[PDB]
Design a protein around this ligand. Structure first.
Ligand SMILES: NCCCNCCCCCC(O)(O)C(F)(F)F
Ligand SMILES: [K+]
Ligand SMILES: [K+]
Ligand SMILES: [Zn+2]
Length: 626
């Protein structure tokens, strides 16, 4: 039962710097480290995190990913003067050395191990390490690209040996390719390495053909190395989210990592002189959030790059915000990925399709308000509450007279409860989300949505779980309706998405692929002000409630996390699961998910072809030119 978020940091790692004029290395300054921590303090985030002390990495730990020949060469640098430090730096590609850099490199390595021990010993839920020098360019016998030792490589090897881990996911969202990490795990199918990076047809540093999408791994580890090259600059939020939805996330949940490590470099953020991208710092609150259902939340974030001092702290804060569980900012303006990004996304999916079958194509502190039935007390997490007002009961009496004949007082209580929690979610912002146990489905749902439009909730997303007619139409304001059922139907409207999954053992896999590839792209582009989750009696405790905790966790990326959930009937297990995932707890893994049955893959692709014209964030192929 892990608790909070670790923040490993030490100011000693800022006590090395460039000592000669060297235009390639001028951007790597100690101020990157002090600005990232000071920004965490100004916004009160550091004080909220469990500080963990920085230790040195033992030379046996360093030899996990490096050779004695190179370690002993670095170990001799603290005795060098400046002229000897230049002579040693010139032996390597874009990296300087300092009398103190060997010391700090051992701290950056040990700090990463400290973070691994913290998360793996269930001492913390997750954590971030603010280390310097970076890691992912460092190779077995050479320093490269400001890196001395591969901090992320150690963590994965350290977590393998000392915790007997079989499946580790490494996500490298730094704008540069982490060839050091690729080389280290090239033939290793236990460490899935994903990296997007500014490539520009190999014209951008490090200018390696192995950085291209062709490198899917060697030997038994082929298919466990995924490169996504950005071939043009100016990539935006829609590009990064299309990369997650249609490349990284489908592979990650099938892989089911036992631990997620992140090469977090924020030179992929707007304003950075090296990445020249256009993604806002808020995007990293979502990249983080979309990964947290993996590995029961066990997530280690290690600082890599990020060179614009202003935009850097903003991106660090968004990551720690999400790491602590704060509501994710609403991302607006999302649409289709540019044609270059779609080109790379389409190529990676095809080259990886021989290893991941879902990529194949056909030939051409109050957070949650819990409102259960009367006289049933329950055990609720620390940040959970309970229930009515007269202005509410008056308004419910107004609603009851004008639109309903409604007599039962038990469902008059729920209508007053639904309104009360909705007003606290929007107008007053006290709570984020809530759950209400409901008897009458059609009235509760139709009253909830109609009251939400007056809050005002501009656009509402409605996720319905069950068969039969929906209690809400496509007309009630700006709404997008999503139904998960088993009754085969073919919808016509562009704001409706009906997913008829084929019941059985593979209901778990088809759901997740439909969530990451269809539901989440549309919802993120829709940008709802409120999410309305519904589940009827017929679908409760049944086979598709395995993914429900995952959906209600991932869907909180929309609408600042404001999600009202209406449970029909009463299931103790179900209400337990929704409230936990609404409250921010960790989600139990689903195990290694096989590929869904091709009968569901086809229905999903028919839905994608139907909506990707209107909702361009569904596209994972270049647009056919007209
Ligand atoms: N001909 C001159 C090429 C200079 N290119 C410098 C690229 C440095 C990349 C470092 C980084 O941002 O990946 C890290 F995270 F490691 F800091
Ligand atoms: K990268
Ligand atoms: K690998
Ligand atoms: Zn970088």
């Amino acid at each position: 039962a892990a608790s909070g978020s670790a923040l490993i940091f030490d100011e000693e790692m800022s006590r090395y710097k460039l000592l000669w004029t060297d235009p390639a290395c001028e951007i790597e300054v100690p101020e990157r480290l002090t600005v990232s921590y000071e920004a965490l303090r100004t916004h009160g985030l550091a004080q909220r995190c469990k500080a963990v002390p920085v230790r040195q990495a033992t030379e046996q730990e360093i030899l996990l990913a490096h050779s004695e020949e190179y370690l002993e060469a670095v170990k001799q640098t603290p005795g060098m003067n400046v002229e000897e430090l230049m002579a040693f730096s010139k032996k390597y590609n874009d990296v300087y050395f300092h009398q103190n850099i060997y010391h700090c490199a051992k701290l950056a390595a040990g700090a990463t191990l400290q973070l691994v021990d913290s998360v793996m010993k269930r001492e913390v839920r997750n954590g971030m390490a603010l280390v310097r020098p970076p890691g992912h360019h460092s190779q077995r016998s050479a320093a490269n690209g400001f890196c001395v030792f591969n901090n992320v490589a150690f963590a994965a090897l350290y977590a393998k040996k000392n915790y007997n881990l079989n499946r580790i996911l490494i996500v490298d969202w730094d704008v540069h390719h982490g060839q050091g990490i690729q080389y280290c795990f090239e033939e290793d199918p236990s460490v899935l390495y994903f990296s997007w990076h500014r490539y520009e047809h190999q014209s951008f540093w490090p200018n390696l053909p192995e950085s291209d999408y062709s490198s899917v791994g060697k030997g038994k580890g082929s298919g466990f190395n995924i490169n996504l090259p950005w071939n043009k600059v100016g990539m935006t939020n829609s590009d990064y989210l299309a990369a997650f939805f249609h490349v990284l996330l489908p592979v990650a949940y099938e892989f089911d990592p036992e631990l997620v490590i992140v090469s977090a470099g924020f030179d992929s953020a707007i304003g950075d002189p090296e990445g020249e991208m256009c993604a806002l710092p808020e995007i990293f609150a979502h990249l983080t959030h979309l990964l947290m259902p993996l590995a029961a939340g066990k997530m280690c974030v290690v600082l890599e790059g990020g060179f614009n001092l202003t935009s850097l702290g903003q991106s660090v804060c968004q990551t720690v915000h999400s790491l602590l569980g704060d509501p994710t900012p609403r991302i607006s303006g999302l649409g289709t990925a540019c044609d270059s990004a779609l080109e790379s996304i389409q190529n990676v999916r095809n080259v990886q399709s021989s290893y991941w079958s879902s990529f194949k194509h056909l030939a051409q502190s109050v957070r949650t308000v819990v409102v259960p039935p009367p006289g049933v007390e329950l055990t609720l997490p620390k940040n959970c509450q309970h229930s009515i007002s007269e202005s509410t009961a008056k308004e419910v009496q107004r609603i009851r007279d004008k639109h309903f004949d409604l007599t039962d007082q038990n469902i008059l209580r729920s209508l007053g409860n639904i309104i009360s929690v909705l007003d606290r979610m929007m107008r007053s912002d006290e709570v984020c989300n809530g759950c209400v146990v409901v008897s009458d489905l059609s009235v509760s749902v139709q009253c909830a949505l109609q009251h939400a439009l007056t809050e005002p909730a501009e656009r509402v997303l409605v996720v319905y779980v069950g068969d039969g007619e929906l209690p809400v139409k496509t007309n009630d304001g700006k709404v997008f309706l999503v139904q998960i059922c088993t009754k085969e139907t073919e919808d016509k409207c562009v704001n409706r998405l009906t997913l008829c999954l084929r019941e059985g053992e593979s209901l778990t896999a088809g759901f997740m692929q439909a969530l990451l590839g269809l539901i989440l792209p549309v919802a993120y582009e829709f940008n709802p002000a409120l999410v309305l989750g519904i589940v009827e009696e017929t679908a409760a405790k049944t086979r598709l409630m395995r993914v429900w905790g995952h959906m209600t966790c991932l869907i909180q990326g929309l609408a600042r996390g404001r999600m009202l959930t209406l449970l029909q009937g009463y299931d103790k297990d179900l209400l337990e699961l929704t409230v936990s995932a609404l409250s921010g707890a960790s989600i139990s893994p689903l195990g290694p998910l096989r590929a869904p049955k091709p009968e569901d893959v086809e229905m999903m692709e028919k839905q994608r072809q139907r909506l990707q014209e209107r909702w361009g964030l569904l596209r994972c192929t270049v647009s056919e030119s007209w």
